[PDB]
Each structure stands twice: as C-alpha cells, then as structure tokens.
From Swiss-Prot, chain B:
GO terms for cellular component: cytoplasm; cytosol; extracellular exosome; extracellular region; extracellular space; ficolin-1-rich granule lumen; mitochondrion; nucleus. One of its GO terms (biological process) is animal organ regeneration. It is an enzyme of class 2 (transferase). It comes from Homo sapiens. Residues 82-203 form the GST C-terminal domain. Conjugation of reduced glutathione to a wide number of exogenous and endogenous hydrophobic electrophiles. Involved in the formation of glutathione conjugates of both prostaglandin A2 (PGA2) and prostaglandin J2 (PGJ2). Participates in the formation of novel hepoxilin regioisomers. Negatively regulates CDK5 activity via p25/p35 translocation to prevent neurodegeneration. It catalyses: RX + glutathione = an S-substituted glutathione + a halide anion + H(+); prostaglandin J2 + glutathione = prostaglandin J2-S-(R)-glutathione; prostaglandin J2 + glutathione = prostaglandin J2-S-(S)-glutathione; prostaglandin A2 + glutathione = prostaglandin A2-S-(S)-glutathione. Homodimer. Interacts with CDK5. Changing Y7F: Reduces catalytic activity about 50-fold. The modification N6-succinyllysine is found at K102, K115. Its EC number is 2.5.1.18. This is Glutathione S-transferase P.
Length: 208, 209
C-alpha cells in the first residue's frame, strides 16, 4: 500500500494524488507539521532532507518526479512503447522546469517578480500547446492516446497557473480544452471537489 | 540509432550521456553549435524548450538531458533489474540533477560571490550519495543494484566536475572516492576520458570551473 508523507499543502504532491485518485488507488496521508519539521529529526532521516516521502510497501522514495515515474511505471501510465516513454519524460521534465520557476516566484520573490513572471508565462506555456497540437489535434492526452503521469503533472501545473494568472490559457485553446477535459474525468473531478483537496492551500506560505 | 548529439562545444549537460554512449560501445555524431549560430536564433526557436542539447535517435528527436539519459537507459538496459530498482535509479538521478542545477547556478550567475557558501555546503550535498553506496553491497558495485545505470554516468560526471571545483571534496567519502576510480577505470570509459574529444572541451561555456 501507499503512504504520502508531506506538509499540509498541495504543492509537489498534488499531481501524484490526482494520479492515485483518478486511477482508483487507495493511499494513506501522513501530515508533517511545520513544527515537527523544525525539530529536525524527520528532515535528517530524509535522503535529500526534503519531503515528499512516499512508501510503496517497504520501498521508500523521495523526489516528487521519482514518485510520479514509479506510479507511471507500475500503473501503466508511461506510454505504449519506448518512443512514447521518452516523449512522456520530455514533457514531464519541461513541467518540472516551469514548476521550479513557479516555486522560486512563490517562495523567494512573489512581490517584485509576479509581473515579470506573468509576462514571461505565455512563452513558457507555448511548448505544451505545441505538443498537444502535434498529437491528434490536442483532443486526447499530452503523449499518445492514453493518460500518462506527465498528464497529471501538466494538469496540476496548469491549474495552479490559472490561480496565479486568471485567463492565462485564453491564449492557448488546446491547453484550455485539455484542462476542462481531464478535470471532468469522474474520479478526478470528485477528488478535486473534495475537502481533502480543496481545504489544503496550494503552497505553504499561503501565496498563490 | 543512429545517434546525433546537438550541443555547444562544452562538456556541460552532455558529458554524462557521452560517457554512457562511449562506455556502452555506441557510436554517435556530434553536431557542434557555435555562439554565432545560437545567437542567430533559428536553431533556438526550433528547440522545444529553447534549449540544447537536442538528441536524435533515428527518427526520434529529444530535448532535456535527463530525458536523453532515461531514453538511453531504457533502450540499452541501464535502468535497474526491475521496477523497484528503476525507482531507485530515478531517485539517484533526480538527486544528481538537483545538485547539478545548483552547480550551474553558481557557475553562470554567482561564481565570485557564491563560491565560499557553495563549497561550505558541498559535504552535506555529497553525503547522500555516500550513504546510498553504503547501503548497496557496501559500495562495491554501482549506485543502484548490481549493474551500471544511466544514474551512474550522471553521478560520475557530477563527482568529477566537483573535484575540479573543490579539490579534495571526496576525501572524507571513501565509497564515493573508490567509486570514481573504479568506474573511471572501465576500459571504454577510461579511453574516452583520456581522449581529446573529452579533455579539450571546457566543462562550462563561460570558462569557469
Ligand atoms: Ca495505460
Ligand atoms: Ca530541465
Ligand atoms: Ca477566459
Ligand atoms: Ca544492463
Ligand atoms: Ca528536485
């Protein structure tokens, strides 16, 4: 069974939770208070001193993208073949890059950086619109014709950017329609509407 | 195959995948991109994320160095023996990428002011890899399991460039030290590391190391 060990935020666990919910998998949440984290003991035991920590039976993993790839591999959300698997990675790596820029903004430079960030945003989102346009006219998934862990990550990234810069997908019809389509998947829709998702802040510092 | 690496004339983010290809007896073409070519803008606008490396494997075109590493890992069987090991391989590689990102940020943006703080923090950043080795066959084999993975090549490069940045940074870490020596001695890799193709490239594009 699966355990997610994280702070009481959506953050870097939002995509992997969406994945698990949408795939109908059961899991446990272990919540780490800022104070438990400050004590230092748990942090010292984490491979790279960070959360999330994830348990799959006796397998303990760190790094949100390691967890996504693991779930992608085990649950068959990693493309139909080797070529698609590579494209799934290429998408997820691009999502991670933009996520890192988003995190940097939220944590270190929200006030002085937001305008610079939002104006730079369309150029950062365009590659995903491009990928969609080259795959069945953008009517299905980011890679190929079945959902992948990259879809869940990309979906999260887009949802949080809509909160940051409302209407930012107006310039991107395929990304816009993709957000609506994936968000409407019944198990995912239910999860996104649920107190367990809605009552967590996006980020620890309460900015979004 | 065939394989083509499209990149600046630097080691940088292609060093690990080149070591991987060389050690695995694979052949590849280098397409070198000069400053003039990159500044012209055409190549850059054609890249998915506006970045190099670009990698060609037959009709497949890839961007993102870790995507290229994972692809070569997948297709060449350098990804652990099973799913549990593959997850550990990813965990190592994501850790390597995190420190590489920090290394690049120093080199490119903050070398003069930031070097002291970086080298001071370095031991705490390397210790996880020593720990991983200690928990896998007493550090006598690879970073994960009993066979080489793309993570080994990436970690090896990370360690090598760090020894340039902070000579002696592995002295306190016997497993990491022995690992660098052991992997660096693999005959095809040893030959590649000794070759002008590797030796005569700068680590980074701005001449800092
Ligand atoms: Ca599937
Ligand atoms: Ca990247
Ligand atoms: Ca609108
Ligand atoms: Ca093998
Ligand atoms: Ca990371």
């Amino acid at each position: 069974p699966y355990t997610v060990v994280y702070f009481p935020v959506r953050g870097r666990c939002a995509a992997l939770r969406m994945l698990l919910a949408d795939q109908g998998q059961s899991w446990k949440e272990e919540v780490v208070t800022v104070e438990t984290w400050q004590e230092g003991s748990l942090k010292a035991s984490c491979l790279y001193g960070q959360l999330p920590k994830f348990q799959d039976g006796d397998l303990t993993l760190y790094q949100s993208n390691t967890i996504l790839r693991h779930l992608g591999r085990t649950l068959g959300l990693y493309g139909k073949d080797q070529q698609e698997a590579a494209l799934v990675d290429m998408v997820n790596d691009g999502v991670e890059d933009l996520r890192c820029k988003y995190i940097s903004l939220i944590v270190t430079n929200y006030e002085a950086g937001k305008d610079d960030y939002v104006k730079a945003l369309p150029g950062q989102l365009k590659p995903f619109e491009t990928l969609l346009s080259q795959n069945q006219g953008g009517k299905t998934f980011i890679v190929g014709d079945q959902i992948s862990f990259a879809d869940y990550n990309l979906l999260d990234l887009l949802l949080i950017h809509e909160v940051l810069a409302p209407g930012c997908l107006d310039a991107f019809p395929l990304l816009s329609a993709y957000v609506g389509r994936l968000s409407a998947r019944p198990k995912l829709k239910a999860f996104l509407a649920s107190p367990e998702y809605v009552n967590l802040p996006i980020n620890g510092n309460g900015k979004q």
